[PDB]
Amino acid sequence: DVDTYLSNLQTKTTLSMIADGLERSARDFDAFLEENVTLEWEAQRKRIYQHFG
Amino acid sequence: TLTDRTYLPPLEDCLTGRTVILSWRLVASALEDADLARLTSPALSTFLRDGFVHELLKHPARVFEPKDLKQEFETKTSSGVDTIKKDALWLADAVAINQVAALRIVLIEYQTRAHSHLVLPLSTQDVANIQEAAGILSLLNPASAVDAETMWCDFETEARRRERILATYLSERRSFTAAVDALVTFLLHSAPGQHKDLDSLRRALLKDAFAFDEDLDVPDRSKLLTMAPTYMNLVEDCIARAQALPAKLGESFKTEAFELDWLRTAITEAVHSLSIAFQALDLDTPYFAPHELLSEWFELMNSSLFLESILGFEVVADLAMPARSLVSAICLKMLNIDRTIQFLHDFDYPDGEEPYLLSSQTLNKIHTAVTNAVNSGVAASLPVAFAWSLIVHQMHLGYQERASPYDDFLREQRLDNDIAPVEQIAMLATSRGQVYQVMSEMALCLGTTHEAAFRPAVGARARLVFQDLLKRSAYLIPYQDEPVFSLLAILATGRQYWDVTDALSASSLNQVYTDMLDDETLFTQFTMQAINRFPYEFNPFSVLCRVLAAALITNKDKADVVTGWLWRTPTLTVDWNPAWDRSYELCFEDENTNSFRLTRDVDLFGERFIIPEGTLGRFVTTARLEFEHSALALLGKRLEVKAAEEICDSGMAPLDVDEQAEAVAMLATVLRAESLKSTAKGGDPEAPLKFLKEASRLLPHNKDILTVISDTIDGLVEKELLELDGPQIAVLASCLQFLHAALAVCPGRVWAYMSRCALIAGDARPGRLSRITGSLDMYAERFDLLSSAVKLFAALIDSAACSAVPWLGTSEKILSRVALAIAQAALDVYESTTTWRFRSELDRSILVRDVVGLMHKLVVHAHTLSSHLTSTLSPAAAHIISSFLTPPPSASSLRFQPLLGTLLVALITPRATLYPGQSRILAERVTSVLAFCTSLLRAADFLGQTHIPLQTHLFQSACLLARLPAANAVYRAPVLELLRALVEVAGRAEPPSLLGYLGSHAARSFISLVEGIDKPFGRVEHAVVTWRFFAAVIRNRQQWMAGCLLTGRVGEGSVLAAAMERLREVKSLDVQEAVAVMDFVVSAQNYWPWTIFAVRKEKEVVDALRGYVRGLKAPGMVMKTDGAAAAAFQARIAAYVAETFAMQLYHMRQMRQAEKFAGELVADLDYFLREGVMVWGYNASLHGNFARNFAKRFPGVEVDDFKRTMWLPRELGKGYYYALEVAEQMLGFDAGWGGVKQSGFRKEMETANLNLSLVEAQVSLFHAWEYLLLELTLSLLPKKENAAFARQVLQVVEQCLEANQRSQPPENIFVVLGHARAGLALTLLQRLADANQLPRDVTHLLALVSSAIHAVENPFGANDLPYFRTLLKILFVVLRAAKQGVAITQQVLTILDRVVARCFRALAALVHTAPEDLALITAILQACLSVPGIEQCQVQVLNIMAAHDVFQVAVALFSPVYGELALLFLLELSALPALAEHLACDGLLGHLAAARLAGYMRRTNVGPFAENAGAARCYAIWAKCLLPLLLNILAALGSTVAPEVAWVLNQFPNLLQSSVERIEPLLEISEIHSLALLTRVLAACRAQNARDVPEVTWDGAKVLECVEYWLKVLRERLVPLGPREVNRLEEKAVGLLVGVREVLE
Amino acid sequence: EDSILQPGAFSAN
Secondary structure (H helix, E strand, C coil): CHHHHHHCCCCCCHHHHHHHHHHHHHHHHHHHHHHHHHHHHHHHHHHHHHHHC | CCCCCCCCCCHHHHHHCCCCCCCHHHHHHHHHHCCHHHHCCHHHHHHHHCHHHHHHHHCHHHHHCCCCCHHHHHHHHCCCCHHHHHHHHHHHHHCCCCHHHHHHHHHHHHHCHHHHHHCCCCCHHHHHHHHHHCCCCCCCCCCCCCCHHHHHHHHCCHHHHHHHHHHHHHHHHHHHHHHHHHHHHHHHCCCCCCCHHHHHHHHHHHHHHCCCCCCCCCCCCHHHHCHHHHHHCHHHHHHHHHHCCCCCCCCCCCCHHHHHHHHHHHHHHHHHHHHHHHHHHHCCCCCCCCHHHHHHHHHHHHHHCCCHHHHCCCCCHHHHHHHHHHHHHHHHHHHCHHHHHHHHHHCCCCCCCCCHHHCHHHHHHHHHHHHHHHHHCCCCHHHHHHHHHHHHHHHHHHHHHCCCHHHHHHHHCCCCCCCHHHHHHHHHHHHHHHHHHHHHHHHHHCCCCCCCCCCHHHHHHHHHHHHHHHHHHHCCCCCCHHHHHHHHHHHHCCCCHHHCCCCCCCHHHHHHHHHHHHCCHHHHHHHHHHHHCCECCHHHHHHHHHHHHHHCCCCHHHCCHHHHHHHCECCEEECCCHHHHHCCEECCCCCCCCEEECCCCCECCCCCCECCCCCEEECCCCEEECCCECHHHHHHHHHHHHHCCCCCCCCCCCCCHHHHHHHHHHHHHHHHHHHHHHHCCCCCCCHHHHHHHHHCCCCCCCCCHHHHHHHHHHHHCCCCCCCCCHHHHHHHHHHHHHHHHHHHHCHHHHHHHHCCCCCCCCCCCCCCHHHHCCCCCCCHHHHHHHHHHHHHHHHHHHHHHCCCCCCCCCCHHHHHHHHHHHHHHHHHHHHHCCCCCCCCHHHHHHHHHHHHHHHHHHHHHHHCCCCHHHCCCHHHHHHHHHHHHCCCCCCCCCCCHHHHHHHHHHHCCCCCCCCHHHHHHHHHHHHHHHHHHHHHHHHHHCCCCCCCCHHHHHHHHHHHHCCHHHCCHHHHHHHHHHHHHHHHHHHCCCCCCHHHHHCHHHHHHHHHHHCCCCCCCCCCHHHHHHHHHHHHHHHCCCCHHHHHHHHCCCCCCCHHHHHHHHHCCCCCCCHHHHHHHHHHHHHHHHHCHHHHHHHHHHCHHHHHHHHHHHHHCCCCCCCCCCCCCHHHHHHHHHHHHHHHHHHHHHHHHHHCCCHHHHHHHHHHCHHHHHHCCCCCCCCHHHHHHHHHHHHHHCCCCCCHHHECCCCCCCCCCCCCCECHHHHHHHCCCCCCCCCCCCCCHHHHHHHHHHHHHHHHHHHHHHHHHHHHHHHHHHHCCCCCCHHHHHHHHHHHHHHHHHHHHCCCCCCCCCCCCCCCCHHHHHHHHHHHHHHCCCCCCHHHHHHHHHHHHHCCCCCCCCCCHHHHHHHHHHHHHHHHHHHHCCCCHHHHHHHHHHHHHHHHHHHHHHHCCHHHHHHHHHHHHHHHCCCHHHCCCHHHHHHHHHHCCHHHHHHHHHCCHHHHHHHHHHHHHCCCHHHHHHHHCHHHHHHHHHCCCHHHHHCCCCCCCCCCHHHHHHHHHHHHHHHHHHHHHHHHCCCCCHHHHHHHHHHCHHHHHHHHHHCCCCHHHHHHHHHHHHHHHHHHHHCCCCCCCCCCCCCCHHHHHHHHHCCCHHHHHCCCCCCCCCCCCHHHHHHHHHHHHHHCC | CCCCCCCCCCCCC
């Protein structure tokens, strides 16, 4: 385990890698909003399908 | 029950390093420097408080007496030990010491191998680097220099190891002697006003060792008086070893160097024994010592020839002179000439002890010893012989009056009839004043000045015997100039002007001085005669006044004696002028007295000084005058007359050059004493002003004493400084000293004169101070000038630093010009000092120290603040920085060679227990040089300097600073600081490899020396210093040093092995050091995680438990409880702990081992829930109150003016933002800063700084907990511990939203919080929605968001765009969580009515950045219209949605991303039936058919994958938005709008063709469903009427065959481009197909 | 001042 950990290690500050979580969140939020608005359009269409009958 | 546990700890600790034995070197250093922290350290406290150490120091002979401790040695060496045991046995066999002492010395040498190696000659690369730095300064030895490899291979040899062991043994002997001497000194002559801990330790040591209790009216001196013979007997063995080296020692080691070292060690031991004996003797001054001991001591001295046999060599003069002086001192002490004469003349028995006077044998022995010493021809016996001669001269007369035991002596050696021998001895001693000269030399070597060989108290108590001898020899030999100069050199010692301080000391130290005014013999013979012989004999009276004013500053009982003598002198005496022969008449009263009376009205200096007619006088054969006057005014008048270059034939003679210099010097010293005693409580603040007024009395109104000094300077500065004789240079030095003295009480006139002094870059006339440069010889005559000028300049700069105020006659421009000239002169002196040839090194050392301190005070004062207060010295600081950071390449080395030479002289100065003055001066010089280097490095780091030419030289200076600490431990902290600053400058600028300059062996030795953080004492200051140094060294690109410091060559002896030992006791360790330890841990983790995290996981059982303990018992609000400043420290510690936990959790997650650790840690976040994201502890109330109170009392100076310029790393203490270190000296001049009962502005400023530090720690904890929770949200994805997790997340969100509303912190001090804590809650709610574990409690959570959106000033399109966007995303996720859940509709309609509409209108008005904001607002409205509470309040919301007429602006913007977003917005608006029909009205169709987009729509290029961006964009805007809107508006009414949609369909058939053609053997399947529903409804309508829907324009054959052929191969053309972060669509598609089967089938 | 190291003068001292 330690062998692979040292093999795949990069010379750089650790506090910068964890920071990437912010970027990843900012890039996931977009897709999450797109899923919100798609499940919303879906819901709306559904309620219309239950309005017409 | 007195073991050697604390004295000699187990060998396992010494070897493993867990406990460094407190060697005698460290104890001696701590006792010599009188350091508070070290003396109060737990280790040294327990070591000294032990009874074993007491018995050892009370019996040093037993420490080295030959004994048989084989059993103890074997028991200690049993349970690298073989080599240690072998060396111990070899040393015990060679030297007569016991085996235990040998083993201890070997262990100490083993622990101190780093120093022994670093004090060795440097390598070849080091010599090459030094030569490159040099471009005088030839203190190297390249002829014998060798490489490092051959130096290390020879270091590990056997012969060299044994030589080093013997050297360490001798050094430890000297250190033990010095330590016990200093301990006795501090215990007997303890200074008052010391720290409570020091007094308690002194009392404990006394009561434990000697039972000396101060609360007893009569302490037990027995055990203290029995310390004289204990060392007088050991001196025998000392001299025996000095005269004969060990026989058992091998002959190969008995080399010249070893013999010299042994002789020096023996001489030092003898001197220390003599000093301890003298101290134990003077402890009981009046009583006599046991004659049984003096007998043996005099026999010893007789035999050894007063140690002249061992001191006869010419290579031990530096140690012989002080040795001879101390021998004479102890001889005169045990002789007690004063008490002896008192007994011989009084005949009364003292009763303290029997004296040698009752033993004739002792008298015979003393007489024969003195005779042998005088016959041998030695100078050391001069004072002792003279004294004895006096005693015999009094015994003879005592026998003549009685013509009892002493008679036996007087008749044994035939000394009764004849008195020839003692008389001849006294004659020889007094001839040529040899006795007086040797006494003066001894006093110089036994004084208080820096030239003294012992400590100040040692010399103060040693001068007592000489003073008593002069007291007792005054009335015998008549008054004469030689005894007077002798007493002057004794009492004054030749110290400088700046050697005067108001430091209160023990009365004992002041005894030697006060005796001049206590005993009548020394009062009516020296003081009275000195006063009477004035100004005729000026030097004695002047020096006496000087020493008295310097010694009686704190003595309030005799503080006005100098003032009284100077203002009310009883008599006058001056030379007689022949012109006055016709102005006197003899009264014929007494011819022997030669009295007379003035007959004419003599007018002197013809208010002016006038003498009344009829004054009596005595002709001293000059004459004395018995007239009362103020000598100060007459001296000032004489100075004025001499400065005016005017001479009066009918007046008194003018003062001589040396006389004028001494006059001005004594005036300056008295003025300084007055200024120092006035500031102290209980004095008079008008003392210096009154003194100056008296000095300027009876003088011309147009000038004062200051003007007199100005005229003197102007007259003496006419010629070139080089063309000046000695005395004129002494006069110039004294006038500069007087200017320095007057700078305090009258800064205005001093600055006004310095503005035109014409001596520093003033004008082009000859006399400038910069012309004294070159390759000259700065002897004592020429050095007293510059050494005073530099200090005068430093005082001027210090006075100018106080720009917040006495100052009549000055201005900003004048002070700025004077400061610039002073800086130029100081820089010229610093550049020229590298060429002068001084008589000694101490002078150059003092000069370098002074100039470096001046430059450092100038540099720090410029960057410490950024307000206008630091503008007076700004041109000067700027000049010095431009000249020390980017100098020209031709004179670049001239400014750097001085520092290199200083470092060389420091790194090759030998260790010596004597001469503490030179040692402390060199230490202060080194510390000043290091501070100056640090200041230059920080200045270069600031202002954006990309190329620092000084770094190349600072690297080769660190090459020497790596070994410099080996000579003195004091340098360990400053040096490290410098290194830290060099590393910091190397970071913000790979850097030059430091290993290439240091070296492998040298670097490893330095690492092994510094790795232990102040182990023998364990102080906090040097600990924080070494932890910041380690953190800075690790943070930079240093990799070799970082690896050698972390690994130790895992870690077994590395810094981390001790950092873990300190971390496992944080519950009791000082919070101040814990912060630095945690900072070091974080610096080692972020850059070297693979090692630190690995070691912590391998030893987590000791760290995780302590972290949990700290977390559980960490209250949130600690201000209210006991402790106010510890709150910030605890917050910083918690922040660092949270950061480390987060980093290790990230590493474990990367290793997939973070589940259990995170699950165990989440239960420790209580302190976080208490004092985490909540930053409301800013308490702006008290800050505003302090600001108002400071602006009301200080209109000119503001509270923000004390803001730091970020020059030095801000401390997390009472000086985080406000510069207190400078304020203490800047605002403490007027009443209000000090305050009663420790109140005022100081305490409030300290509380404000503590609050700011607490806020900074809270922000750090905020970031740490943000990262921790961000990673935990991903870690804790499974369905467990959901309750506590959601509770914690919701509490954090609520605290953030509440802080966003409550009082905000300032933006100039801290970073703007806007957009810093919004994304935190944003991502938290994001992940919680992804997990779908919310309690749908938005009923209260949204109120804070609404209040924030209302009270944000609506910066929709302002600079605060990130803040607006994050608030919008937060409210979006909040309303989405609410949708998942009635009392909600009334609470969420506020956003639909006031927020969405206002923001949309603002965006539509600005757009005339915008795309993303409009899309976010559209998404917000879409997700908000989905709450269940809106499906019933549609009626209520129709009016609010119609009031703003948003549809008009939407259609306007639609008339192409903006059109897309407007279309989506109107679509989501149509989600409500009323709004659906409103959009379905003809308002829509008009623009739908008139839109300019129809231009691109009619073109056949439309398509989903069309190459053109416009075509694809239009196709998407039509597919994703137009069809749902069509269906929505058809739901309202279809029968009426069917013609319209039919016409739209046949007007643009290209869209239908593209939709039915792309799909061949998803957002388009929704289109198919919409078309199917439209077909169904239009067919149902057409079934009744035929007028409408003329053509369907739609095919069933093709579409049916398509849906047939599309119901694994489906993945052929499924390449989703948009979503790439997340089975997804197939289900939806099949659903739509079912819908088709439900509408078409 | 006077005779150096007056060895003969007698005074009360």
